[PDB]
Design a protein around this ligand. Structure first.
Ligand SMILES: CC(=O)[C@H]1O[C@@H](OC2=CCC(/C=C(\C)C(=O)N[C@@H]3[C@H](O)[C@@H](O)[C@H]4OCO[C@H]4[C@@H]3O)=CC2=O)[C@@H](O)[C@@H]1O
Ligand SMILES: [Mg+2]
Ligand SMILES: [Mg+2]
Ligand SMILES: [Mg+2]
Ligand SMILES: [Mg+2]
Ligand SMILES: [Mg+2]
Ligand SMILES: [Mg+2]
Ligand SMILES: [Mg+2]
Ligand SMILES: [Mg+2]
Ligand SMILES: [Mg+2]
Ligand SMILES: [Mg+2]
Ligand SMILES: [Mg+2]
Ligand SMILES: [Mg+2]
Ligand SMILES: [Mg+2]
Ligand SMILES: [Mg+2]
Ligand SMILES: [Mg+2]
Ligand SMILES: [Mg+2]
Ligand SMILES: [Mg+2]
Ligand SMILES: [Mg+2]
Ligand SMILES: [Mg+2]
Ligand SMILES: [Mg+2]
Ligand SMILES: [Mg+2]
Ligand SMILES: [Mg+2]
Ligand SMILES: [Mg+2]
Ligand SMILES: [Mg+2]
Ligand SMILES: [Mg+2]
Ligand SMILES: [Mg+2]
Ligand SMILES: [Mg+2]
Ligand SMILES: [Mg+2]
Ligand SMILES: [Mg+2]
Ligand SMILES: [Mg+2]
Lengths: 104, 55, 175, 136
RNA sequence: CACCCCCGUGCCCAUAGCACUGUGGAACCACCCCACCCCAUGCCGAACUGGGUCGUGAAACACAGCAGCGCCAAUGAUACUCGGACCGCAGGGUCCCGGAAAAGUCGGUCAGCGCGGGGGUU
RNA sequence: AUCAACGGAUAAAAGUUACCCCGGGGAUAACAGGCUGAUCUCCCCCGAGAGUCCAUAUCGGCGGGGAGGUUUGGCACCUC
RNA sequence: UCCCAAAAUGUAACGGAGGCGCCCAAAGGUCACCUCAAGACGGUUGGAAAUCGUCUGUAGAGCGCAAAGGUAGAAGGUGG
RNA sequence: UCACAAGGCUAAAACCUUAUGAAACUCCGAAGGGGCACGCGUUUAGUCCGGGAGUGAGGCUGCGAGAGCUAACUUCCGUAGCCGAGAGGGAAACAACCCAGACCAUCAGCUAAGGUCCCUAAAUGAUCGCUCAGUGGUUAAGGAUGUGUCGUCGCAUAGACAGCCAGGAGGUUGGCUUAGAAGCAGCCACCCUUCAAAGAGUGCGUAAUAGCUCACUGGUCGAGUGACGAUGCGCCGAAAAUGAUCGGGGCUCAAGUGAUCUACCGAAGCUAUGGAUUCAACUCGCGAAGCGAGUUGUCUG
């Protein structure tokens, strides 16, 4: 049910790992990939898609994953830890990954 | 406040002794003055019944 | 009724025979103390739906129904009373003793007039026109008939907080 | 009387009686004065006593109940080797606590049936009538 | 966060919950559509998941109403009790002085504080 | 390594003594006394029935309160 | 292991219950995924209980064995 | 979670109202207790390293619990104090209890517990009371018009509780039951006639009758009475072995006991004076240390 999301949410040992949380919302056809210091209740990146995506749907992945990692490299935020929620990591969000996994 | 020792120490608990000691009274008849402050006046609550006290 | 004191130290009373006290208006709450004698008198006179007046030794009469009594379990006398200063139109959920009326036909064939609930938790008449008791005719009952909270009567403008099917006063068999 | 299944064994202590010091189930009610123990037979006693007096038959409420296992070692052994087998059962009646409620009889029947009841017990006792109204 | 509002996410771990209920659709969410392969079912696109709409506001989600339930909870008073003293053969009980609940009653409440985003105020 | 008598004496081991001996113990039992009073002994209260009828002339269930210190015991305090 | 144990650890008794001298090649490491006991209705063998279905459903289950503490964001159930 | 009092209700299990017990139950949960810190304010100890040990049988009361029989001068833990290793006063006598920790001297003073008629130091004290039982000076369930205090309830200037006066009635031997019960051996019921009043009635009785008294009613008399609790203090219940008694004498015209005040007696504790030792600081000399001396504070079962 919720279970999976809160499961990964805690296997992101909130702040104690030191690094930066990396959200997603690939459950709609509007996503939301985010960047959090989670300790400080703030968000530091933000690659939306609702202000015009491109035209693609799940090809959009690598793209907002390149836009995010771009806004990151700009901010200075140079290190990853990949949150999700109800997501398998395999296809769409996996693209977002690969092109964030080298995209910032 | 103003302290006097009238009841002895014998037959009485370890702490009540050690307070009569660490108050400075070493035998009955003994008299004294005390800094009207907490701790040291709460060292005269504890062993009250052994001291006749003034004000 | 009438008190005099309201501190935290009770040597002003007790031996001199007064009861520990509270009474809340709900915006006004006050601790105090009221002579035993009068309280016992009126409280058996008037009880848990009694309503009576509080002319504190200051000059400020008040309207008081009796709410909770708390007593010396051993000596079996009361030592404390919770009050409820009544308001105006809407009141509370009055507790009222079920009685029994008439020479019942249930006791002529070996049965017995048993009140399976000595007291009844109703709802609101208005805090000035309260039922003190209740009157449940029992005559029609034989042996084996109970009286549910539906069959219970009403005086008008009142509601029954109690489940309309649970057993109040029912006749029991002989032996 | 006795119970059905349990733990087996016990101990003891005192200090006043919890509840219920109030006159439910009946109009008239008899109330302990001493921190006794009470036994299966000690109460079955008053059962059969009052149940003599009321005839057919009243309505009788034994507000107490034996739950305590009390032991006695086998007679004549020096202590050790065990705790005593369960001799008898006990209701740990404390004071102000009310033991008997009856109604379905009059005032005289309460007075007397309670008198005869209380002449069977290790306790001084007082009988009375309702008004204990925290909860009926 | 400029005002509302929706999407993601946190501090807070029920005065923040549930049921009853009304608002809610292109503006986000959701259902929906199809799935030969990615990918998946101890069988089945139900779920994880790949293609993308209309359609529907129903369901789910969000908001608001709401004190029926849960939750929270006084003051007074009491139990018990530190330490002073005492009574009864004893089971146990009292007095002075402080600390002091539990449960119940008065009541209280449809939480409250953030960050970023999208989207509107002829 | 049931060296399980589980910090484990030898690799390796059971009885009996009324023929009995030494060293000690009232540190410990049988005797007595002692403290206790369950059991034992007796007395009191309540009365349910018995006594044709009538609890109490006598008798007294189920149960309660005590005494006494003569029983069998418990405890092991003076004396081994 | 649990009371006894007097709200810190500790504590005796020939006091009050019960358990161990193994088991596991997966029951471990990791990775991923699933959620429980029951009751109501309704259903071929059945029909107290089997299987399926739905509404309820924070633990009223499960953990190889003893119970206590613990646990549903898994320690529980299934695979690479 | 195991237990369990009544009642609902159904086919009882559940579950609702009412309701309670728990060392091995816990929605809740103190008082205390412990760790750390601080020393905000006192007091003296602590910790390490090295030499010498002894002890490893404990005992009693108070509060906590277990085994016992809410037995033991009982036993096994916990906890405080005491004796052990503790003299002194008190508790008649009495390791443990209440006061109190004895460095010597004194033919000096104040107090503690505990006391103050004589033994025996000190008020045969003062005022408000209680009990009359020698309680005091050893126990209980249970019983008592003992005697004081508070409170409930009822009754009567419309005649009361009691004294004496008269009816204490007809149905109706009510029915049941029975050898007969007809007020009265047991089982369901208490209805009428009149009345100044009178109830299938309450006891003694009879095998059953009958018969004698009251519930009420009226005359009188002249006023209080009657019951159900709370409570101070006394009574009964209260019987063992060599000689009686509270330590004794004796006390109630308190020397008993509840209250309030004040005076005195009382210890080896406190105080006066005089002196000694132990530690320490100060002063001095020989030569830092070190010794004796001196002064002060201190210490000594
Ligand atoms: C001379 C000694 O031995 C020494 O020991 C001490 O004394 C005693 C030792 C033992 C004893 C009794 C024993 C063993 C016994 O079992 N006795 C029973 C019973 O109880 C008794 O009553 C008799 O009745 C039926 O038959 C008897 C029956 O055998 C009695 C003594 O007094 C000491 O004073 C002496 O100097
Ligand atoms: Mg105390
Ligand atoms: Mg207090
Ligand atoms: Mg407080
Ligand atoms: Mg809402
Ligand atoms: Mg060994
Ligand atoms: Mg060997
Ligand atoms: Mg021979
Ligand atoms: Mg020979
Ligand atoms: Mg020899
Ligand atoms: Mg013998
Ligand atoms: Mg012997
Ligand atoms: Mg006997
Ligand atoms: Mg007879
Ligand atoms: Mg003997
Ligand atoms: Mg001995
Ligand atoms: Mg402790
Ligand atoms: Mg030990
Ligand atoms: Mg609550
Ligand atoms: Mg040894
Ligand atoms: Mg010991
Ligand atoms: Mg011993
Ligand atoms: Mg010795
Ligand atoms: Mg001495
Ligand atoms: Mg002495
Ligand atoms: Mg002497
Ligand atoms: Mg002694
Ligand atoms: Mg004095
Ligand atoms: Mg003299
Ligand atoms: Mg000197
Ligand atoms: Mg010496």
């Amino acid at each position: 049910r919720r279970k999976l999301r809160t499961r990964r949410k805690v296997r992101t040992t909130t702040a104690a790992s030191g690094k930066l949380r990396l959200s997603v919302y690939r459950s709609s056809k509007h996503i939301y990939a985010q960047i959090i210091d989670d300790s400080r209740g703030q968000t530091l990146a933000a690659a939306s898609s609702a202000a015009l995506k491109s035209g693609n749907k799940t090809d959009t992945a690598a793209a907002v994953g390149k836009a995010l990692a771009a806004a990151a490299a700009e901010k200075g935020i140079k290190q990853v830890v990949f949150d999700r929620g109800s997501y398998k990591y395999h296809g769409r969000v996996k693209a977002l990954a690969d092109a964030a996994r080298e995209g910032g | 406040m103003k302290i006097k020792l009238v009841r002895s120490v014998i037959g009485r608990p370890g702490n009540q002794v050690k307070t009569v000691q660490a108050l400075g009274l070493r035998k009955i008849g003994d008299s004294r003055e005390v800094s009207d402050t907490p701790a040291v006046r709460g060292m005269v609550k504890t062993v009250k019944h052994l001291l006749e006290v003034q004000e | 009724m009438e008190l005099t004191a309201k501190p935290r130290t009770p040597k002003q009373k007790l031996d001199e025979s007064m009861i520990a006290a509270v009474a809340y208006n709900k915006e006004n709450n006050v601790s105090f103390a009221l002579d035993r004698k009068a309280f016992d008198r009126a409280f058996r006179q008037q009880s848990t739906t009694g309503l009576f007046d509080i002319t504190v030794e200051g000059g400020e009469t008040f309207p008081a129904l009796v709410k909770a009594v708390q007593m010396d379990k051993r000596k079996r006398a009361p030592i404390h009373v919770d009050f409820y200063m009544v308001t105006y139109g809407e009141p509370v959920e009055v507790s009222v003793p079920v009685h029994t009326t008439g020479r019942s036909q249930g006791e002529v064939q070996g049965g017995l007039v048993d009140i399976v609930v000595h007291n009844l938790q109703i709802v609101a008449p208005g805090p000035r026109r309260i039922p003190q008791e209740l009157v449940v005719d029992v005559t029609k009952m034989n042996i084996g008939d109970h009286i549910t909270a539906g069959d219970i009567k009403l005086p008008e403008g009142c509601t029954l907080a109690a489940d309309p099917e649970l057993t109040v006063v029912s006749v029991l068999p002989p032996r | 009387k006795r119970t059905k299944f349990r733990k087996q064994f016990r101990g003891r202590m005192t200090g006043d009686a919890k509840g219920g010091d109030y006159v439910a189930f009946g109009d008239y009610g008899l109330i302990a004065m001493e921190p006794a123990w009470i036994k299966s037979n000690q109460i079955e006693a008053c059962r059969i006593v009052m149940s003599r007096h009321f005839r057919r038959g009243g309505k009788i409420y034994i507000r107490i109940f034996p739950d305590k296992p009390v032991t006695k070692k086998p007679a004549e052994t020096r202590m050790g080797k065990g705790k005593g087998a369960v001799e008898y059962w006990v209701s740990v009646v404390k004071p102000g606590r009310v033991m008997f409620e009856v109604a379905g009889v009059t005032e005289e029947q309460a007075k007397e049936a309670f008198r005869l009841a209380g002449h069977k017990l290790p306790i001084q006792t007082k009988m009375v009538k309702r008004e204990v109204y925290d909860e009926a």
